[PDB]
């Protein structure tokens, strides 16, 4: 259904643009996987260190809560009505796609919660709250890269699937259609010249008599 | 007059096929992919057309069931399944919803059971218009009930695996003889439509 | 831009008490609903953890990162493994009195296949 | 019915359709990968690889009969489900899977 | 003037570019995927489907005037803002927009 | 000698255009996709040649024309705009520098003011050389001021919002005649030179 | 030796590799962006733009020999470090940097 005369000119530029886009998608997928491996290893090491620090902070908070002799979680949940430690969503993307970053921030007006003043348990609850916030800041700062790792891991499959599908399906249709149209044009030109030679052969013999 | 043509050099741009297809008013296509699976002949909605089906739909709707609505619904389902096959093949199966999977599977099952008209006996090659109308109406009502059942909250694998023998029973109706029922009208499609309607309420909840 | 400042916490009473004492979460006064769910050892069911994870995953947009323990995430491994969006991000950390396991990470399973 | 099996045509047509369906499922599974692979594409690619590496492999002088090739083709084609096979009669499918 | 509209030839220039942009966005959406389209590809893809099924949709015995075709064609063009059309003058476009 | 060529076969493989392209000394392009989009008369910056520009540059030096200096930068920006649009449409819109967006933004106003003709401009009866040479100085000064402002430290939205009425006045300056103020230069070219320093200084700071 | 330069063969291969790496870095620079571009793509991209207007740029009435072209290519190739230059000898690279 394609044009037989002068149809390979658009297919050559379309095949060259598809090959250039497949090469750029292959390079972007290779860089995305190369960053995704180190992001996966750093996410595993940060997950292990965050698990160890969360285990130490949970052991210290469990030791302070068990040493307090009372339900500190009910008083902390009842007295907790504001977020003292917050995070800021920012776009820090050095890659083919956009990445998610997080920055820890502490409010200056937000002081310590009123959970101390019960004798010996107040100082252990205040020190356990300060050590819990100090461990929670490094835990959130270590766990902030999971959105960027999940974003790069989500984009790498679409880039590899698009590069593999476009690179796999791009070349053979125009590659076969260009040779078919060129062969049909050459067969039509040879069929025209073969019919023209028989017409010129009578004119040569007719002009030879004069 | 029904005359078949073929190319003389391996292409479909010959003067016999273009001159014969240009003067005629009915076109019967041929697909190499459907023909490779032992489907003689493979006729699709994109490579086929006929203007006499509208005038034949009046007598075919008077002396028989409403085949003209099932022909337009089957052509509209095959037109969406044809682009859905290239869209699912090119981008992937993670960019389409569960509604297109029932149309692609119903178009593949209806194209496989309807395309194969050779068989291995005298029962897989002679089919009446009432058997094809009831078989197309059963798959059209099953796809329409599966789309409305999947639209209210459900999975495509849970609905296709939840159907089971209900989908293979309609596909296995072509292996039976055409003398069942009264004269040509098989009664299994009426119970298959009630079983698909009963399974449609269970597939939604 | 920044549209989330609160962090969700789904863990034990010790880690949830330390995270609530640190100030990562709070209770919003617009609906009287807290931004965290305490997990009781043997007192809570999996329907409350899946309902709290489903309500904190898609029903709220102020959650930056969704915290979940490895022990509590094992009972919700179907809904946690089915959720792969980064808004909010799912970070599987080690639970209290439990070691690190590579099989309890939903990002490690998808990152392992076709790596 | 005296020189070949009666179910050789149904197994030949079902194996011919399963070969093209396994080739299309392997071609779509090669580009798509493992993130959007269908359930039928894994059994079609496994039956296409086992049939291509079992039925297609043969020596230059090793004799083989059509009865053993139909029995091995029935066991190789038996991995598919009953709902997928719709190009054969129910008596031949109930007699041999 | 006197037998047709003045902006009928001006609307065909933006309708032709929107129809070509709808075919390019439709081919790019099916070829590359839904993760490589721009903001104009969605409005051009919806304008190509609405214009292809709205302007060319009619019967075989119902007459269509030029004023009804221009009024029905002007309603299908209103899918994007006024900063995305450049194949018409702003004076004649602001009077019939 | 101005002889328009027509199609007598393929798009560029015709014998009239092939034999006529060798004997000619000036060649102009023609966008096939832009011609069907109602954007005639269109030209191609990649397909074009002229041999009288060197001899015309000597008389242009005595006439003090700046047409070729802005024409080379407009041909370079129009050449890079097709590669940026093709790479953006092929690779996908996920990331890009401000230089390609400013080059495509200058190529959109230059293609709208220079490409649109024969029904898209109010004044098309006479086109002076000073208005055409001074018209490209506003777009080249806006693109060079945006690239110099982005190179020295600035945001893309701060520079695009910092331009404001200068982009709409530079795009709408083609409808105005050159008979305002002087007999060969308009007042918008003189006011744009003073407003370009304030817009470039306000966009950078 | 005696009718041509000695480093003209390695300078043409280094200029061709820097031009191909500058074309690949310029093509990948649009997809990667300005804030995420690599140092090799920016250093090769500056050498491609500087070499395209310096080495290929010549006068209509000016005659430039191969010795002046090699010295002009040595100035464009002097921006790269000594560790990133491995298509020439160490004596010719140290003498002509």
Cβ-Cβ contacts under 8 Å, A20 against chain G: 27
Report DSSP letters for D17-54, one per residue: HHHHHHHHHHHHHHHHTTSS--HHHHHHHHHHHHHHHH
Phi, psi of F85 (to 5 degrees): -75, -35
Omega into B41 within 30° of 0, i.e. cis?
yes
Question: What are the boundaries of each domain within chain A?
Answer: 5-207
Both tokens of A197, joined, read: 């030679």
Cβ-Cβ contacts under 8 Å, D38 against chain B: 93
Are D36 and B94 spatial neighbours (Cβ–Cβ below 8 Å)?
yes
**Chain D residue with Cα closest to C110:** D35
Omega into F139 within 30° of 0, i.e. cis?
no
Are F39 and F118 spatial neighbours (Cβ–Cβ below 8 Å)?
no
In angstroms, rounded to a whole number, what is the distance separating the alpha carbons of residues F32 and G88? 48
Which alpha helices (H) appear in chain C, and where do they start and end?
13-22, 46-57, 70-75, 77-82, 106-112
Cβ-Cβ contacts under 8 Å, A21 against chain F: 87, 90-91
Range of the domain at F176: 51-205
Please, is G16 exposed, middle or buried when counting C-beta atoms within 10 Å of its C-beta (0-12, 13-18, 19+)?
A: exposed
Which alpha helices (H) appear in chain G, and where do they start and end?
8-32, 39-54, 66-76, 90-95
CATH number of C16's domain: 3.40.50.10580
In angstroms, rounded to a whole number, what is the distance separating the alpha carbons of residues A24 and G29? 10
CA B190 to chain centroid: 18
Task: With residue A198 as reference, give the H or E element that holds it.
Answer: helix A171-208
Q: CB B197: neighbour CB atoms within 10 A? A: 12
SS3 state at A7: coil
Strands B26-27 and B49-50: antiparallel
Both tokens of A19, joined, read: 């090959």
Please report all neighbours of C, defined by 3+ CB atom pairs within 8 A: A, D
In angstroms, rounded to a whole number, what is the distance separating the alpha carbons of residues F160 and F158? 6
Both tokens of G96, joined, read: 């002509």
D3 Cα to chain C: minimum distance (Å):
50
Name the domain count of chain C: 1
SS3 state at C66: strand
Are E73 and E13 spatial neighbours (Cβ–Cβ below 8 Å)?
no
CB proximity C1 to A under 8 Å: yes
CB proximity G36 to A under 8 Å: yes
Method: cryo-EM
Range of the domain at C101: 1-115
B40 Cα to chain D: minimum distance (Å):
12
Enumerate long-range contacts of E73-76, CB under 8 Å, 24 or more apart. E73/E11, E73/E15, E74/E11, E76/E47, E76/E50, E76/E51
Both tokens of A155, joined, read: 């984009």
Q: Which fold has domain A5-207?
A: Helix Hairpins (1.10.287)
- The DSSP bridge partners found for residue C9 are C67
Are F68 and F57 spatial neighbours (Cβ–Cβ below 8 Å)?
yes
Both tokens of F66, joined, read: 């700046």
Are A177 and A60 spatial neighbours (Cβ–Cβ below 8 Å)?
no
Are F124 and F116 spatial neighbours (Cβ–Cβ below 8 Å)?
no
Are F70 and F45 spatial neighbours (Cβ–Cβ below 8 Å)?
no
Are A61 and C21 spatial neighbours (Cβ–Cβ below 8 Å)?
yes
CB proximity F11 to A under 8 Å: yes
In angstroms, rounded to a whole number, what is the distance separating the alpha carbons of residues C66 and C79? 13
With the CA atoms of A45, A46, A48 and A51 taken in that order, what torsion angle do they form, in degrees rounded to the nearest 10? 180
In angstroms, rounded to a whole number, what is the distance separating the alpha carbons of residues B100 and A119? 67
Q: Do D30 and A157 touch (CB under 8 A)?
A: no
In angstroms, rounded to a whole number, what is the distance separating the alpha carbons of residues B48 and F112? 44
Both tokens of B21, joined, read: 């297809």
Closest to G28 (Cα-Cα) out of C6, A95, E89: A95
Phi, psi of C64 (to 5 degrees): -85, -55
CA E37 to chain centroid: 19
CB proximity B90 to A under 8 Å: yes
DSSP G65: -
Both tokens of A82, joined, read: 């504001």
Are A149 and C105 spatial neighbours (Cβ–Cβ below 8 Å)?
no
Closest to F103 (Cα-Cα) out of F133, F132, F131, F83: F83
Phi, psi of A137 (to 5 degrees): -70, -40
SS3 state at G13: helix
Beta-carbon contacts of C29 under 8 Å, excluding residues fewer than 6 positions away, are: A81
Distances (CA, A) of E49 to B80, E22, F127: 14, 8, 41
In angstroms, rounded to a whole number, what is the distance separating the alpha carbons of residues D44 and B69? 35
Enumerate long-range contacts of G68-73, CB under 8 Å, 24 or more apart. G70/G5, G70/G7, G70/G8, G70/G11, G73/G11, G73/G15
In angstroms, rounded to a whole number, what is the distance separating the alpha carbons of residues B11 and A204? 37
Q: How many CA atoms lie within 13 A of B125 on its CB side?
A: 7
Are E61 and F13 spatial neighbours (Cβ–Cβ below 8 Å)?
no
Regarding chains F and B, contact by 3 or more CB pairs under 8 A is answered as no
Which alpha helices (H) appear in B3-98, and where do they start and end?
15-23, 32-36, 53-62, 67-90
Report DSSP letters for B147-191, one per residue: HHHHHTT--HHHHHHHHTHHHHHHHTTSSS-TT-SSSS--THHHH
Which alpha helices (H) appear in chain E, and where do they start and end?
8-31, 39-54, 66-77, 90-95
SS3 state at C92: strand
Omega into C88 within 30° of 0, i.e. cis?
yes
Minimum-distance CB partner of G35 among A20, A94, A96: A94
Both tokens of C25, joined, read: 């979460």
In angstroms, rounded to a whole number, what is the distance separating the alpha carbons of residues A146 and A138? 14
Task: With residue F57 as reference, give the H or E element that holds it.
Answer: helix F53-63
In angstroms, rounded to a whole number, what is the distance separating the alpha carbons of residues F163 and F142? 9
């Amino acid at each position: 259904v394609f044009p037989t005369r002068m149809t390979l000119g658009l297919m050559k530029t379309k095949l060259k643009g598809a090959n250039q886009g497949y090469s750029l998608l292959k390079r972007k997928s290779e860089a995305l996987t190369k960053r995704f491996r180190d992001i996966t290893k750093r996410i595993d090491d940060a997950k292990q260190k965050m698990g160890r620090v969360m285990q130490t902070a949970a052991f210290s908070l469990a030791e302070v809560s068990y040493a307090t002799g009372e339900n500190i979680g009910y008083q902390v949940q009842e007295s907790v009505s504001t977020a003292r430690f917050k995070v800021r969503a920012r776009q820090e993307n050095v890659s083919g796609v956009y990445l998610s970053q997080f920055e820890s921030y502490i409010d200056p007006e937000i002081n310590d919660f009123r959970l101390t003043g019960l004798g010996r348990g107040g100082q252990q609850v205040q020190r356990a709250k300060e050590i819990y916030s100090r461990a929670v800041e490094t835990l959130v700062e270590l766990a902030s890269l999971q959105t960027a790792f999940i974003i790069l891991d989500e984009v790498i499959k679409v880039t590899n699937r698009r590069v593999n599908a476009i690179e796999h399906v791009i070349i053979p249709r125009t590659e076969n259609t260009i040779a078919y149209i060129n062969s049909e044009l050459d067969e039509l030109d040879r069929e025209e010249f073969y019919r023209l030679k028989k017409v010129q052969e009578k004119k040569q013999n007719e002009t030879a008599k004069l | 007059i029904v005359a078949a043509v073929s190319p003389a050099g391996g292409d479909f741009s010959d003067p016999v096929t273009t001159a014969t297809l240009g003067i005629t008013q009915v076109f019967w296509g041929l697909d190499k992919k459907l023909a490779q699976r032992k489907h003689f002949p493979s006729i699709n909605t994109s490579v086929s057309y006929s203007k006499y089906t509208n005038v034949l739909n009046k007598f075919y709707d008077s002396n028989y069931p409403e085949f003209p609505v099932l022909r337009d619904r089957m052509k509209e389902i095959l037109s969406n399944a044809e682009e859905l096959e290239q869209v699912v093949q090119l981008v992937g199966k993670s960019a389409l919803s569960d509604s297109d999977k029932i149309t692609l599977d119903v178009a593949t099952l209806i194209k496989e059971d309807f395309l194969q008209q050779n068989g291995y006996s005298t029962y897989d090659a002679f089919c009446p218009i009432w058997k094809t109308f009831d078989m197309m109406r059963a798959f059209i009502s099953y796809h329409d009930e599966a789309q409305k059942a999947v639209a209210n909250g459900a999975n495509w694998s849970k609905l296709a695996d939840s159907t089971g023998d209900v989908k293979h029973a309609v596909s296995s109706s072509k292996f039976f003889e055409p003398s069942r029922g009264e004269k040509e009208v098989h009664g299994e499609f009426e119970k298959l439509l009630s079983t698909m309607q009963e399974r449609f309420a269970e597939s939604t909840d | 831009a920044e549209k989330r400042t609160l962090i969700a916490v789904i863990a034990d009473e010790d880690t949830t008490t330390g995270l609530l004492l640190a100030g990562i979460g709070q209770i919003t006064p617009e609906t009287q609903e807290k931004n965290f769910f305490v997990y009781q050892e043997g007192k809570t069911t999996k329907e409350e953890i899946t309902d709290k994870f489903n309500h904190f995953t898609e029903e709220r947009d102020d959650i930056a990162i969704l915290l979940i323990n490895q022990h509590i995430a094992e009972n919700i491994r179907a809904r946690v493994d089915s959720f792969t969006n980064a808004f909010p991000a799912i970070l599987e950390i080690p639970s209290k009195d439990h070691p690190y396991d590579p099989e309890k990470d939903s990002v490690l399973k998808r990152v392992r296949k076709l790596f | 019915e005296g020189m070949t099996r009666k179910d050789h045509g149904d197994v030949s047509n079902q194996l011919y359709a399963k070969y093209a369906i396994g080739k299309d499922a392997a071609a779509m599974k090669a580009v798509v990968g493992e993130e959007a692979l269908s359930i039928e594409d894994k059994l079609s690619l496994e039956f296409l690889e086992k049939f291509e590496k079992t039925f297609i492999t043969q020596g230059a002088y090793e004799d083989r009969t059509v009865f053993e090739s139909l029995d091995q083709a029935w066991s190789l084609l038996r991995i598919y489900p009953k709902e997928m096979l719709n190009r054969i009669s129910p008596k031949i499918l109930d007699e041999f899977y």
